[PDB]
Design a protein around this ligand. Structure first.
Ligand SMILES: [Cl-]
Length: 425
C-alpha cells in the first residue's frame, strides 16, 4: 500500500496572476502565431492579441471592472472569443465560460451561481442569454460578438483609447479566484469551482511537465470545458499555436493536420472513429503529427491500435483529469514510451508534482496495487473551493480531493479508472 507520487519540477509561474502570465507570454512570443481558425483559415500573432486585449482591458476599466467582478462568456471558438477573457484577466477579474449548447434552465442556474457583471455573447446565443437573465431576474450588461443596437459590441470594446503603451496588468492577490468552472457530481446541481491564479497556473504548468508536444495543437472543445481553457494556457506558456474548428469531421481534420502541419490534437475517444474511417488516409501528408491527446470515456484496444497505424509518427496519449484539478494521470511521451505500446487500457501514470491514492471507503485506509477503491488526489493545482457553496466534503482528512471515481493501480503504478460512485454531490 502506497501513495503514487509524480516527478518533481520547479514551478516558474507560481508568483503571478493569470493576467500577468498571459501578458508576459504575449511579449515573449510576440511574432509567433497565437491562434488559427481552422474553418476560416485566418490567424493572429501574439503581438496582435496583446494589442487587442490591452484595448479591451482599458475599456473594461472605464466601465468600472476590477478584480472583484466576474466576467462571463457564451461563445463557440473564434479569433475573438478569448480576447475579452484575456483582457478581463489583465484586470484580475474572475472569468467563466458557459456552454452555448445548454438549455435556458441550465444557463439560468449557472448565471445565478456566478452573477456576472458583464457577459460577452455570440450572436447565435444572444436569445438564450437574454431569456436566461430574464428568468434568473438578473441585471447584467451584455456585449455581443457582432452587431447590436440593443447591447454593446465587441468591436466597440477594441476601440483604441488611453495609454496603451503604459498599460500593465493589475497587481492582485494570487490566491484570489482567477478562473471558474462548474461541478458535475452524480447528484445535486452544479456549483462554481474556483481556481486561484496559483492553482490554475499549476494546472497549466503541470500539463507542460507531462511532456507532450503542443507546438501546433488542434481542438474542438469550447472554453466551457477545462480542456479548452487549459490548452489556451498551455499554448501561451511556450509560444505554441492553438488551432480550433467548430465541428469535428474526419476528412477536414486530416486536411488541417496537413495544411497547418499540426503536431497535436485533443478530442474525445468517440470522435476518433471519424478519423479511422477516412478512406485512403495515405493521400494526406500527416508526417508533422506527433501526439493524439484523448480521454474522458474509455478507448478500445483495437481503436487505439488503429489510431497508431493512422498516425505512424505519433503517439496516442490517453489521459485522466477533471475540472477540479486538471490532468491527473497520463504517460510521459519519452520516459514511458515502452509502456505506451504495452499497458492498455490504463489512464497512464500520475502527473508531475501530484499525489494519488486509492482508499477503501469502509475502514478508510490506502490500499496496494490491484485493489479497487476510491481515487483521491492532491496537488497545488487543486481548486480552492466553491464560489458561494461549501466544498468541505470534496476533501478528505488529509486534504486530498475525492475524485468520485473507483479504480486501482498496477505494480508499475499505471492507473485504471473503472466507475463513478453513485449519488455523490
Ligand atoms: Cl458555488
Amino acid at each position: 500500500a502506497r501513495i503514487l507520487k509524480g516527478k518533481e519540477f520547479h514551478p516558474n509561474f507560481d508568483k503571478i496572476s493569470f493576467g500577468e502570465f498571459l501578458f508576459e507570454c504575449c511579449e515573449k512570443y510576440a511574432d509567433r502565431i497565437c491562434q488559427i481558425d481552422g474553418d476560416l483559415d485566418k490567424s493572429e500573432t501574439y503581438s496582435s492579441v496583446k494589442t487587442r486585449s490591452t484595448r479591451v482591458a482599458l475599456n473594461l476599466q472605464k466601465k468600472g471592472i476590477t478584480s472583484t467582478d466576474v466576467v462571463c462568456f457564451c461563445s463557440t471558438n473564434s479569433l475573438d472569443n478569448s480576447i475579452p477573457l484575456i483582457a478581463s484577466s489583465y484586470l484580475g477579474a474572475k472569468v467563466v465560460n458557459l456552454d452555448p449548447t445548454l438549455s435556458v434552465r441550465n444557463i439560468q442556474h449557472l448565471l445565478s451561481l456566478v452573477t456576472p457583471r458583464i457577459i460577452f455573447v455570440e450572436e447565435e446565443s444572444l436569445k438564450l442569454i437574454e431569456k436566461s437573465l430574464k428568468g434568473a431576474k438578473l441585471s447584467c450588461e451584455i456585449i455581443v460578438f457582432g452587431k447590436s443596437t440593443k447591447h454593446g459590441t465587441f468591436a466597440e470594446m477594441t476601440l483604441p483609447c488611453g495609454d496603451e503603451k503604459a498599460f500593465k496588468p493589475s497587481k492582485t492577490d494570487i490566491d484570489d479566484t482567477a478562473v471558474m468552472f462548474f461541478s458535475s457530481g452524480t447528484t445535486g446541481l452544479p456549483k462554481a469551482i474556483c481556481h486561484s491564479h496559483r492553482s490554475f497556473l499549476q494546472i497549466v504548468e503541470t500539463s507542460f511537465y507531462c511532456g507532450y508536444d503542443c507546438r501546433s495543437i488542434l481542438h474542438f472543445t469550447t472554453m466551457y470545458w477545462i480542456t479548452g481553457m487549459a490548452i489556451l494556457g498551455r499554448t501561451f506558456l511556450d509560444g505554441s499555436t492553438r488551432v480550433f474548428a467548430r465541428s469535428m469531421e474526419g476528412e477536414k481534420t486530416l486536411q488541417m493536420i496537413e495544411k497547418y502541419k499540426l503536431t497535436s490534437l485533443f478530442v474525445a475517444p468517440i470522435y476518433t472513429y471519424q478519423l479511422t474511417n477516412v478512406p485512403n488516409p495515405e493521400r494526406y501528408d500527416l508526417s508533422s503529427f506527433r501526439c493524439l491527446l484523448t480521454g474522458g470515456t474509455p478507448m478500445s484496444t483495437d481503436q487505439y491500435k488503429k489510431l497508431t497505424q493512422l498516425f505512424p509518427k505519433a503517439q496516442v496519449l490517453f489521459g485522466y483529469g477533471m475540472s477540479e484539478i486538471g490532468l491527473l494521470s497520463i504517460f510521459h511521451p519519452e520516459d514511458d514510451k515502452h509502456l505506451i505500446d504495452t499497458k492498455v487500457g490504463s489512464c497512464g501514470k500520475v502527473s508531475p508534482r501530484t499525489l494519488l491514492k486509492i482508499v477503501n471507503p469502509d475502514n478508510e485506509e490506502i490500499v496496494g496495487p490491484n485493489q479497487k477503491g476510491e481515487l483521491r488526489v492532491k496537488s497545488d493545482a487543486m481548486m480552492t473551493g466553491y464560489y458561494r457553496n461549501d466544498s468541505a466534503e470534496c476533501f478528505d482528512g488529509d486534504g486530498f480531493l475525492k475524485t468520485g471515481d473507483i479504480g486501482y493501480y498496477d505494480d508499475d503504478g499505471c492507473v485504471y479508472v473503472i466507475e463513478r460512485i453513485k449519488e455523490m454531490f
